[PDB]
Amino acid sequence: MQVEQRTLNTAAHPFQITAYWLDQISDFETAVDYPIMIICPGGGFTYHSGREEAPIATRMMAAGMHTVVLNYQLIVGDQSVYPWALQQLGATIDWITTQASAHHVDCQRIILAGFSAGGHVVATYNGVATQPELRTRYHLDHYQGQHAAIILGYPVIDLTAGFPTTSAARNQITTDARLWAAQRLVTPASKPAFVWQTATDESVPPINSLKYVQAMLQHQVATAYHLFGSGIHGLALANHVTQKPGKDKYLNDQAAIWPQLALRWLQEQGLLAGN
Amino acid sequence: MQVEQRTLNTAAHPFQITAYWLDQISDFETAVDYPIMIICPGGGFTYHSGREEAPIATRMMAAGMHTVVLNYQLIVGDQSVYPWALQQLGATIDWITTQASAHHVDCQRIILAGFSAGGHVVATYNGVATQPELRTRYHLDHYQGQHAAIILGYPVIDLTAGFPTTSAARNQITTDARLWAAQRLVTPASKPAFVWQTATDESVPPINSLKYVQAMLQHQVATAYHLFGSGIHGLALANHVTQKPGKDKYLNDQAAIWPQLALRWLQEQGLLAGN
Amino acid sequence: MQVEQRTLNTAAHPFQITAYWLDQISDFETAVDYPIMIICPGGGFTYHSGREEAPIATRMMAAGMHTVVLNYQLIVGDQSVYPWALQQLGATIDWITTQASAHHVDCQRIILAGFSAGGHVVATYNGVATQPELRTRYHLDHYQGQHAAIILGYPVIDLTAGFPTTSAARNQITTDARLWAAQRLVTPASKPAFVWQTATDESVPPINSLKYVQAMLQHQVATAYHLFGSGIHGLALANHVTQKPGKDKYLNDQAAIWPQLALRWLQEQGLLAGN
Amino acid sequence: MQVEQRTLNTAAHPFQITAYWLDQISDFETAVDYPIMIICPGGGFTYHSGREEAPIATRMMAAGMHTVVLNYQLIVGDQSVYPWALQQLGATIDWITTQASAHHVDCQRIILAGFSAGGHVVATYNGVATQPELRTRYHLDHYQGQHAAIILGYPVIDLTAGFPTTSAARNQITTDARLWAAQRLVTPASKPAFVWQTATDESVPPINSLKYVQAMLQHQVATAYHLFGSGIHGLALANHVTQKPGKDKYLNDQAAIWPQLALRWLQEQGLLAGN
Amino acid sequence: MQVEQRTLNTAAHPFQITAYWLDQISDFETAVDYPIMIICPGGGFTYHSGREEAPIATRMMAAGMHTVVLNYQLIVGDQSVYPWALQQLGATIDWITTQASAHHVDCQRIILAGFSAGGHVVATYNGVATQPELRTRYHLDHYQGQHAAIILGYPVIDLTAGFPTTSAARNQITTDARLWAAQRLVTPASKPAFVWQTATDESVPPINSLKYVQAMLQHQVATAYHLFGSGIHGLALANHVTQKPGKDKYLNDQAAIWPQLALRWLQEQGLLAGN
Amino acid sequence: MQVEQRTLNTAAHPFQITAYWLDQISDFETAVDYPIMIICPGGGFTYHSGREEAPIATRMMAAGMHTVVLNYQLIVGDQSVYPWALQQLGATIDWITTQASAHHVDCQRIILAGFSAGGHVVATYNGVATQPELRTRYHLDHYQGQHAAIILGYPVIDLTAGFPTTSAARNQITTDARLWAAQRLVTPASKPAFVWQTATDESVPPINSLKYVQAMLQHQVATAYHLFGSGIHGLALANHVTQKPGKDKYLNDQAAIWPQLALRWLQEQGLLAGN
Numbered sequence A, B, C, D, E, F: 001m002q003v004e005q006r007t008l009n010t011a012a013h014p015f016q017i018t019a020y021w022l023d024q025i026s027d028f029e030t031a032v033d034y035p036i037m038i039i040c041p042g043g044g045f046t047y048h049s050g051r052e053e054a055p056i057a058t059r060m061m062a063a064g065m066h067t068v069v070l071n072y073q074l075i076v077g078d079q080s081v082y083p084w085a086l087q088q089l090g091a092t093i094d095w096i097t098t099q100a101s102a103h104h105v106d107c108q109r110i111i112l113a114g115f116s117a118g119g120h121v122v123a124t125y126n127g128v129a130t131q132p133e134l135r136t137r138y139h140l141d142h143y144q145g146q147h148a149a150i151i152l153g154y155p156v157i158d159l160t161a162g163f164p165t166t167s168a169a170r171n172q173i174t175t176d177a178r179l180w181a182a183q184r185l186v187t188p189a190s191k192p193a194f195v196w197q198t199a200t201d202e203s204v205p206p207i208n209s210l211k212y213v214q215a216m217l218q219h220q221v222a223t224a225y226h227l228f229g230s231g232i233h234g235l236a237l238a239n240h241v242t243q244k245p246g247k248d249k250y251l252n253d254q255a256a257i258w259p260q261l262a263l264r265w266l267q268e269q270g271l272l273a274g275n
Helices: A054-061 A084-097 A117-128 A132-137 A167-173 A207-218 A255-268 B054-061 B084-097 B117-128 B132-137 B167-173 B207-218 B255-268 C054-061 C084-097 C117-128 C132-137 C167-173 C207-218 C255-268 D054-061 D084-097 D117-128 D132-137 D167-173 D207-218 D255-268 E054-061 E084-097 E117-128 E132-137 E167-173 E207-218 E255-268 F054-061 F084-097 F117-128 F132-137 F167-173 F207-218 F255-268
Strands: A002-008 A015-021 A034-040 A066-070 A105-115 A149-153 A193-198 A223-228 B002-008 B015-021 B034-040 B066-070 B105-115 B149-153 B193-198 B223-228 C002-008 C015-021 C034-040 C066-070 C105-115 C149-153 C193-198 C223-228 D002-008 D015-021 D034-040 D066-070 D105-115 D149-153 D193-198 D223-228 E002-008 E015-021 E034-040 E066-070 E105-115 E149-153 E193-198 E223-228 F002-008 F015-021 F034-040 F066-070 F105-115 F149-153 F193-198 F223-228
Touching (some): A002 C002, A002 D002, A015 A054, A054 A105, A066 A084, A084 A105, A117 A132, A149 A255, A193 A255, B002 F002, B002 F015, B034 B054, B054 B105, B105 B117, B117 B149, B149 B255, B193 B255, B223 B255, C002 D002, C015 C084, C015 D002, C034 C054, C054 C066, C054 C255, C117 C149, C149 C255, C193 C207, D015 D054, D015 D084, D034 D054, D054 D066, D054 D105, D054 D255, D084 D105, D084 D117, D117 D149, D149 D255, D207 D223, D223 D255, E002 F002, E015 E054, E015 F002, E034 E117, E054 E255, E084 E117, E105 E117, E117 E132, E117 E149, E149 E255, E193 E207, E223 E255, F015 F054, F034 F117, F054 F105, F054 F255, F066 F084, F084 F105, F117 F149
Parallel strands (some): A034 A105, A193 A223, B034 B066, B193 B223, C105 C149, D034 D105, D105 D149, D149 D193, D193 D223, E149 E193, E193 E223, F105 F149
Antiparallel strands (some): A015 A066, C002 C015, E002 E015
16 A cells, blocks of 8 residues: 655645555456545635545545545635635545556546535535536546545535535635535536435534435436434544544434445446445 | 565575555654564465465454564475475564564564464474474574463474375474474473364364464463364455455455454453553 | 655645654653744745754754745745745644644644744734634635644844835745734734843844834733854754854844743743653 | 656646666776656656656667656646646756756756657757746746757647647647747757758658758758658657557668767767766 | 566575566557566676676667666675576576566566676576476576576676686585576577677686587577677677776777667567567 | 765674765865764663663764764673674774765764773774784774774773673673773773763762773873762763753763863864864
8 A cells, every 4th residue: 555645746736745656466367446535625715634534534544546636725724625626636636647557546436525615625626527518617628537436425416505504705715606505506417426414413504414415316416415414513433433532422323324325336337346 | 564575584594574564643642663564474385375374364464463474494496395484484583673673563462373384383393493302302502582372373392293195295294203292292281272163174174273272272271262163274354355256265254353253362362452 | 864855735836844753761650742833034035944844843853843945935936925934824723733643742732933034924924824813814714733833043023124125025035024024913812922132133123023022012912032142044953053154143143042032931931841 | 877756846847757867887986977857758747748758758768868757747637738738847857957966967958858758848948948038938037057969850830830730729839929830930049950850751641850950050050851652650769669469660770870879969069978 | 657666585595687668658558578588697706797797688679678787696794606506596486476567577588697707607597497307406496587698798608617716716606506507508499699799708708608609509509600700898788888997998889789789689589569 | 965874784793773874064175074973882892872872872973973873782682792792893894984975074083982881892902903912803904994093981890890780781781801891901002082971870889980991001001081060870961851851860060061171172183173
């Protein structure tokens, strides 16, 4: 296993990525190309939450895929998240394509993972990057690669839907109201989506994920949705690994099966080798 | 996550280790000390099998523990495995103790994992390192640290028990017949053991693991034993990750739950935080 | 000791930092959080002087603190230093806060060091970052962390005060005349300052430091000022380590005690453990 | 030999460089300063071709010079190549000057290599960077260093001359028509040029290189030109090393002597030690 | 290109290797496995000459092969070169086999290069490793891999043949007189050999190489021999790259074609792709 | 500044070194060769104390010298310290000579530092390495380099003199009674020594250092001796940097000037540039 930490510059606003590369198993006769998952952590667009980076990355790596953690654009400074964050997701994917030979990467299996605030970036991208008109509008010309499916964990979907709380904050993320609501950007061309949240989420209302899923169904796009009956926002792995010390509110033993479900879902979609 | 590849020299025969360090989660208020698992791959004492290194290491890392992969002494050259391999397991543990500050390592939770040939080294160590008389005999004086529990996956236990096949091969591993049979070295001081194998193992007869477990019970030492009804030798993770390309004989969906069992067992023993 | 060389991107103009991390001492029972000092070298805003980077960094490290060397914005290109350099100092501090767990960093003890041209960036920041109105104006919204004290070595303070020599050069650094004079930005909210220079400085008149100190006193802010009676500009460590080969004009044995004074001053302010 | 991979930020649009540093030979009594060659690969301004990076870099390293591979600005996004790419070539050179002590670099021997699309960037730079009026216009103020000679392999020279094929593509590279034709920017101040191409080039007509050479002659600048009678575009090393697997059209045994010619030419110009 | 510096421990006397790995070219559709050359520098068994390491390594890398530089056992201490050095050559080869997946290495094309003192180690190995009786005697049991051809540059062949000068020195290298003369160990099973030297060699008489070649012919083993009419011992690359500063005696323009000859020879033997 | 962590193998018992390399200052016209100090920490021959490694290393680096931390042989296993540790000190020095070109190292200024147990290794070496008869006896043949001076901090000198406490422990370190007493190995050929200790040392009686100094005087070898009137054993830097958390017994403000004295002493001896 190799760990790469790089700045990528092929975007208006350069960003940092941290890649976790799988090594080829030594006693194999033939070499295998592994899937790759790009992870966008949460952090309310003001930071990137460690809880939703390496603990999750490692979990997916255990199932035999490379992972890259993307440091998408934030509010810090006087900067806005959009459109820059979309340009960065595209750059990352493009960069992966250029790393396929060196690292055995199956470009037919690039997957996007989003959590809380990072879920907005992913959900929006799933809409924009699949629509020629919007690739042009949001400057994704000439970026190679395309993702195959997305995974949303307690995602922020509509900015008018509960998070954030004030019209100033919503516009600070973006003044582009076409990107405010990710479910309004779903078309049949959108890639399939594994979505989960808890019903008792309070900082990012469950309505967010639901509206997205509703949009995928109505546009006949393959989706799977797990709304667990309990648990706070930002459960991450929902177990001891991502549990803040002392605080039992970060433990949910039923939500904690989400990775197993997600992985099984990837297999169903033909995006991960099956047992 | 950091990856360290080092030669350790505080043993008669220097060896290579590859350590996979957990990083502290950024948005924690207080820092946490994680458990650490040392992994001894299989390879019939002639090599170290990649299949039983990083795929397993990564799997355990996902449950929130550091891992170190130990390149124990091999037959290559005209060298023997013993006593040198025991000295190396002790050196590794000692070295970990010196790395605890830098990496947040819970020395009350050092765990040893063994697979096939690597299982012999571990099972033997669990006997020797816990017996003052044998620490002296096998030169473990002044090595700090002590492991807390061991995990054996389809282990080689008695060298007179099926593997290897010829009296020459057995002596090439070691001329020390006191180390030939790891179950004869079990005493109440032995640390607890999670053991698993398949009943249809042919290169290393199931009798090996059984005899060990039988010894642990009879010396009133806490143990757990999972003998799956089917599957070849060297299943590793028993899933797509460690499956040799094309060959379905490396897939066992029932044996594949061993990690989940093992981890739950570690929790029971108080050696891994519980959910 | 670890050495990190990274581009940081959470600012309009991305920059390079070189961090020198202290490692936890192995034979300590409990872990300790160390202070951290950010160093801005001189170079007349056209380059970063090596003399004022690692030789100084190492000197402070010896007293038991992490150091980061910041490559603040320069005139090169057609670029200006301001406002970008202020955004970068804030980004660096913010980034440190996100590295505190991994490296044991005491965020109640972040310190800023400035030399010659780098002194302007620091002195200005000490004014801006402490004034809510100016954090907003100069785009420091949402940057975590705050420094505790600053250290100025032969600093450039007022751009109308001797350095640079022509009105073109002054405006090339910045057209923002509110940032021209760092002493006019001092308010009671400014953090404490250790200031030193030589009286015989010719490229950056001693008047610069003096005016700053005068402003700190008049706003009742804790400060300490050492104006050595002799020596050229850019003495750095004033000893053999930073002495240009052959040239004795870079040796001043009385100015060379500045680090000892500075460190003792940090102790007085409670920003460095005391003996 | 050391390998460095860094983002450089002292330009409007930050870029990645990959440097291959020569190490000092251990059994030398005195240390030697080696030349350095900057390489701009081809890729039609949409990507950087691996074929024209390390295989070429390594080839030149064998003749005893450091190499740096520059990731010049691309069309990707909605970005244009110019003026940014010129700023980046200057930044790279400047950065090298700051690395001379650490790596023994002979700044009187910085050389620029260009291939296909990368040849345009180099050829243009050879014109701009040598003309005070154009350094000012294209923002190369305060960048230290200057190259000594350039090398063009099947270069794109005039954008109205065959590559690219549509007026949209030409303007997407740049709307600045003063940079469209690199031969119109040649003056006596231009540095000497080693130029080669194949006569049967179809994607970038041989006319391109010819027009450049013609301009160098007419301005009395030292140049050498090798137009091989056969071979496709993008032959690179023209041998097995850069040959796409299976495709014999990337093999030209006569064009394959270009490196030997180029190196001998560097010696003639006093830019590489001679045998 | 990646650079690896590792201690290998699977030998009685652990040794350092420095590997220079080729990276897969990014714009290839299919991946290619490259040959690998192991280089044993000279140094009179008291040191390893830098002149015969990276300058040569890089030269071969340019022709599209990985290289590893082996730090074979030396006289330093009271240690002898043999048998340990043979064990180390075998370990290196074995280790390469375990690195083939990760680095695309063609194990049907492992090549050994020897210079001066390093030539003895190689020439001897070519005899021992190919003779079952001698693999057993010199402890090469269970080492995977086998080399395909060897390359000797001004090699030391018979220790009674001019180098070294005193019977004490000869025995300090080894008391094993069966290894004193490498030509007496040639049998039809020996791998093919490219040999070169200068006729005016004085520290290691030309007779050495000649006797070896004579042995290869008489055992009907494919060999090629280039005895250049002039030049001192230890010419290395014979050009400016390996020329000690000031001393023209390290320049031979006719001997300097040896790499081109050697590479062409590798192609003839089917051990390097041909143009 | 670069940090190197390597195993060295040119000794019977391979060892780890951690080197801290000074980088050349960028804005120097000419390059300078720096001194290098090798540090042997304490630890009672059972471990290497972190307190006496990087905190001290960094302190000396601040005065403008490279440092290497040597992991000398320990009792761990059933191993003895001698003769192996002497072979390792010689190997380290030899290795440095081979690193001089790459890192600008002044081989006329190699210095050895010893603390507590590490002081024995140094003091003994200062005797052995300077006596042709003893280089032969203790196998230092063919190791290049030689140290210039040594520094002993609260050193263990005579093993019959207080440390260790039992005749078993003394022999476990070494059965070679010729190495038991380092002061009995002093001859005029011994290099100069800076020695310090506290008079109230209880685990290693002050008599140890005194006897050494007495031997240096009586053999007319230049020495300097600072016996501070108070303080425990293992004060290290005697300040907050090496102070175990909470325990004031590791603070001695008078002993804490030892580095300043030592450095000034190095200048007097011409082994460090003077101000």
